[PDB]
Amino acid sequence: MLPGTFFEVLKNEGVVAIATQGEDGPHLVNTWNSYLKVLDGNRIVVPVGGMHKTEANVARDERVLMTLGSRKVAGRNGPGTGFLIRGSAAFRTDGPEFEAIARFKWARAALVITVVSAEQTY
Amino acid sequence: MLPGTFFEVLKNEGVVAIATQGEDGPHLVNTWNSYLKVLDGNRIVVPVGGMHKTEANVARDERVLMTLGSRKVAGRNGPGTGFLIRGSAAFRTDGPEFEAIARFKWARAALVITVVSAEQTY
Ligand SMILES: Cc1cc2nc3c(=O)[nH]c(=O)nc-3n(C[C@H](O)[C@H](O)[C@H](O)COP(=O)(O)O)c2cc1C
Numbered sequence: 001m002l003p004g005t006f007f008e009v010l011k012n013e014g015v016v017a018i019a020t021q022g023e024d025g026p027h028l029v030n031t032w033n034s035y036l037k038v039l040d041g042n043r044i045v046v047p048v049g050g051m052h053k054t055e056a057n058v059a060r061d062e063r064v065l066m067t068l069g070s071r072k073v074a075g076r077n078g079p080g081t082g083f084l085i086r087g088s089a090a091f092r093t094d095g096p097e098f099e100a101i102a103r104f105k106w107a108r109a110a111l112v113i114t115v116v117s118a119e120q121t122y
Numbered sequence: 123m124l125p126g127t128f129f130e131v132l133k134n135e136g137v138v139a140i141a142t143q144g145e146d147g148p149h150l151v152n153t154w155n156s157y158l159k160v161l162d163g164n165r166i167v168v169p170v171g172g173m174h175k176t177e178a179n180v181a182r183d184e185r186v187l188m189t190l191g192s193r194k195v196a197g198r199n200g201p202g203t204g205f206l207i208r209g210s211a212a213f214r215t216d217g218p219e220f221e222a223i224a225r226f227k228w229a230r231a232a233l234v235i236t237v238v239s240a241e242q243t244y
């Protein structure tokens with residue numbers, strides 16, 4: 001489902017943002033474009049070092065939002081583009097999804113987002 | 123209270139993310155590092171073209187989260203750093219805050235975030 005333009009964004013560096021529902025409002029954490037791994041089945045894997053508040057939020061509501069982009073990829077009306085990703089999150093500490101990010105030796109886990117929609121929003 | 127490292131980040135391009143409280147989960151939208159205008163009094167101003175869902179969310183709860191960063195600025199984890207900003211948001215459609223982004227002729231409003239806290243998170 002993820003489009004070619006998305007993979008082009010991933011070729012460039014940038015700040016990824018991951019929003020979850022917290023008790024008193026949204027919560028928002030980050031990773032880097034270059035840290036993301038994409039798997040078959042529309043899955044995006046993030047290396048987790050911290051994200052303890054994020055993990056607790058995911059346990060109460062697995063639905064998350066992710067944005068990322070790059071000024072170096074042409075958008076619909078001008079330089080740069082990016083995406084809003086909606087999907088369901090789960091945390092893994094072993095298995096192939098963990099092996100995707102295991103080169104990051106500080107990772108205590110893998111955050112795996114199963115994408116339901118990806119919208120190019122610029 | 124925005125620290126010097128934050129302004130270093132703004133010398134570099136990137137994707138800014140802004141999270142708001144939706145009816146049933148967070149909402150998350152973006153701008154570019156290069157579009158932000160910082161004013162005295164801890165104010166970050168964002169040119170608004172769209173952000174109608176975000177505006178309705180700000181009406182329900184003025185508290186927002188913003189993240190931004192840059193690989194080109196040193197952090198505490200080698201190359202790269204970024205910030206979690208918490209603040210109160212308002213949409214301005216007149217006045218000096220609107221004029222600060224009014225060269226963007228596509229702007230219908232300025233999203234003004236009055237920063238309460240800035241945390242360097244990498
Ligand atoms: C640009 C950037 C990159 C980040 N990359 C990671 C990452 O890959 N993994 C991670 O666990 N935290 C990363 N962080 C830190 C998280 O955003 C977050 O502050 C931390 O994991 C704590 O999460 P929590 O607030 O959900 O407990 C990054 C921060 C920034 C600014």
Ligand SMILES: Cc1cc2nc3c(=O)[nH]c(=O)nc-3n(C[C@H](O)[C@H](O)[C@H](O)COP(=O)(O)O)c2cc1C
Pocket residue numbers: 068069070080081082083121122137138150151152153154157168169170171172173174175176177
């Ligand atoms: C990297 C990037 C930058 C964007 N810059 C802006 C911007 O400066 N102002 C704007 O209104 N929308 C911008 N957008 C679009 C918003 O993220 C959002 O999709 C749109 O304004 C609709 O907001 P809403 O979902 O709150 O209605 C940008 C999107 C991307 C991917």
